[PDB]
Subunit: 248 residues, 4 copies
């Protein structure tokens, strides 16, 4: 495929519905050699299976809240992949309490801190830890959501974390571009990984249907291939034109 | 390729350096059946050659300033392609006088009128004329430039025409999305189709080089394939991250 | 008031409901000396009567569709205001059939030409005709609408013209800054100058209410006073936060 | 003045050069009654002396890094202003080493945590602590910078925090609108509160000059007065049009 000859690390695969899962399927399909990570033991075995399917037996543990964990994982990965071509950052989180009800009432210093640390900082923490291992022409990818650009009910602090992550994409792209590395994001429309949210999106979205992990996977597979060589620091909307419409 | 089974019309191919040329090369490479148009006789024979190379002997005349010319061309095209899957709108123009020196002094009512008619209206004029001939899953594509979002010296009225064209993309996408048609644009970085402009871009661009018709072609080939099924109404920047940087 | 010493030309007063009307009162209240224009024989009386109430007796005819009408009006104005400090451009028009139903079917080459000419080109045309009459410290202001950034049902081709207009604001600001002129736009929320539109807006609007011609007028007075000396080429949203919200 | 009747809290006054300082004078000039805060023992004297010159004797300590410090300060304020009409948030900080050199190498998990906490979270933290003390018609204002939208050399992690901050502005506006509170930000151009930066800016800036704390103060006074009743969740650019220009 258009990813033949590329070595790509994929984080965040927690189930067959996970966006990261849809992305690995498509990159594999296009011939990329894959490697996966898992947040903790409770998910290992399970992530080892997905990897076997995509011709990969590279399954490493990594918690992004810890630098030591990130470095340790890239050390292992380094054993089988002294060099590689980028990674898919598909990690997101905020304390349950943070995402419901009035934003100003829900947000807490700690809530803000964790959501920004896990959802935004982990992206450059990861680039930071593997920077000398990336080949020229490598590409990094992360996932955002429209809640970064607009105020969406309940999305609350996760919206500030995503605005931060989107800016992280421009700064990472600007600093890593000179050594042949591109960095972008995909702002996905809602995907079940609410039933109302999804109903709504569907009727108001230009393409008249919510997008899928397959739709996102192909966009990610392309954004991490040399096909998108002229694109860096971009937040591509793969939400069927939802954000560009109004009052449908 | 990822365009096998798609029938795509390509306008604006005026030479081997034309963006439209770079786009046809890539769509052909990916297996799309192509068809070309030419503004006038002075370019026919020449455009008939490019077409033969890309396995196409469908070369039709079409001046977008005339509805009759657009309808007549789609009538011919209809003879060999009763249905097809979209087109690449790679047309741009403004009276020479309009693009140099102070904007407020250069712009003229006529200058404004022509630049907006040829660069922006011709895009939906074309969708309008072939709308019943598009298959489900079709995709339309046009080309814009950063001058639509920011005030660039000398670009003058062409910048208002491109802002118009970018908005045209959202409205066309919003109206045609329900019948399975997506519409997007690619805002390309500067491409020689100045020597200073290009010098500058190159040093300040994240990827440290100006983009190419090949880089744009692959992005266009992807945006017109089902790979980008979840993307509509978007202006993708294929300028190496130039617009997202500042003061490099 | 903060506009004392300021001589500003105001266009587009058609009724006490008119946005240009709320703007003229606001500016008058803050001490500006005003001059008015009226499009034709039908509006002359209404405009003369308002100019009188606002303490003005400069009531000049002007059809921005015509360069000659623009020059003649400014020659008239210059006999009483050899120099003045800017003008409000509150003009808008698209042929009746352009604004209802599917965008691509409603739009036509002529409907497009006129919407852009009247709604966008007329702004810089006026700036051209009076460029040498503006004191440094002058400010030009126009009015746009969210339809310029999102695809809004039925706004159709007016969305494209507004987009062309907002770019005009950027190019005119960049061109005229060196001589002490600022150029901005207010992107106002909908105002009854639909019943459902206004009904939808009010509940999903951050400030929980549609904006009034008093809100737009006060922001207009600000954007044309020395208070906004540091703001130029900006599109200020005065829609109660409507556009920065989503899925409310 | 247009702020008579208004009681506003101003944070971040550190010197006569301070932006919060130009803002306090401007607001004072327009008739606002002010209250001030100072971060620590080192700034208390300077702040007391300015409060005196601006006719105020409410000078309270507050370290936004601490929730308790925020509550205590508002309990102090409430004894003299049971209700007031908003506050200016002009606070910013990132550890010394964060702002120079390559972005990815300079950033660290701690430098990131602190920049976001102090520069972004503190805004809503203050809004939390005093939410019930705001009269309807209140306005909250903060200060951002273009580094939030473009990747700007050396601004590094502060760009991510500002981005998080501007989204905060949107989420706080959407949350507090229903109770009559507006929330906005001024994205100011650079001010000496570098010599080359300022040198570059001035020549490529539309208004041909860097902005002053008087320009930012007048726009601040406006954004916190009833004059801006129709503006909420907006990021107003007060940079002389710098950001809407390119390749100047
Ligand atoms: N589902 C949607 O509607 C949607 C839409 C747009 C964007 N996104 C974004 O896509 C990304 C993936 O989300 P998803 O919908 O696939 O959900 P998901 O639960 O399937 O995947 C997210 C991953 O977060 C990982 N994670 C959490 N904390 C971690 C830590 N401390 N260390 C390492 N890994 C950790 C988990 O292992 C998990 O697999 C997120 O950034 C999310 O914000 C989701
Ligand atoms: N070259 C750059 O630096 C650059 C960068 C970004 C975007 N673009 C855009 O890409 C598009 C293609 O430009 P290009 O650089 O390939 O130049 P080009 O000259 O190679 O192609 C543009 C085409 O305009 C066509 N044209 C003009 N009037 C026409 C009419 N009345 N009817 C039918 N066709 C007509 C010509 O046939 C010509 O081939 C334009 O819209 C341009 O604005 C160019
Ligand atoms: N009403 C709203 O809800 C709303 C919302 C957002 C933006 N706007 C914008 O504000 C501006 C004013 O609109 P309005 O609602 O006050 O409408 P309006 O009908 O009250 O006034 C607009 C004016 O356009 C003038 N005009 C039209 N063609 C002209 C020509 N050829 N020459 C000279 N004058 C001409 C008319 O005399 C008229 O008074 C427009 O640009 C509009 O797009 C209106
Ligand atoms: N100076 C510029 O060119 C410029 C340009 C654009 C935006 N800004 C923004 O304007 C705001 C003001 O910056 P400035 O240039 O006036 O700098 P400044 O040093 O004059 O003032 C900022 C204030 O931050 C306060 N502060 C820091 N940590 C604090 C804490 N933990 N608790 C309480 N107070 C604390 C300090 O007392 C200080 O007075 C910032 O948010 C900055 O990012 C400045």
């Amino acid at each position: 495929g258009f990813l033949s000859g590329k070595r790509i690390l994929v984080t965040g695969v927690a189930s067959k519905l996970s966006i990261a899962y849809g992305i690995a399927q498509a990159m594999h399909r296009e011939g990329a050699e894959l490697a996966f990570t898992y947040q903790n033991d409770k998910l290992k075995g399970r992530v080892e299976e997905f990897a076997a399917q995509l011709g990969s037996d590279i399954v490493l543990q990594c918690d992004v809240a810890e630098d030591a964990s990130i470095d340790t994982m890239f050390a292992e990965l380094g054993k089988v992949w002294p060099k590689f071509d980028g990674f898919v950052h598909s990690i997101g989180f905020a304390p349950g309490d943070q995402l419901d009800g009035d934003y100003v009432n829900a947000v807490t210093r700690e809530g803000f801190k964790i959501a920004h640390d896990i959802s935004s900082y982990s992206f450059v923490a990861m680039a930071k830890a593997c920077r000398s291992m990336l080949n020229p022409g490598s590409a990094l990818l992360t996932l955002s959501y429209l809640g970064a650009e607009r105020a969406i009910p309940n999305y609350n602090v996760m919206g500030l974390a995503k605005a931060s992550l989107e800016a992280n994409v421009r700064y990472m792209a600007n600093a890593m571009g000179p050594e042949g590395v591109r960095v972008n994001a995909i702002s996905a429309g809602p995907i079940r990984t609410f039933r109302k949210m999804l109903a709504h999106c569907e009727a108001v979205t230009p393409i008249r249907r919510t997008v899928t992990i397959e739709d996102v996977g192909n966009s990610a597979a392309f954004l991490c291939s040399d096909l998108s060589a002229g694109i860096s620091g971009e937040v591509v909307h793969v939400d069927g034109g939802f954000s560009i419409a109004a009052m449908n």
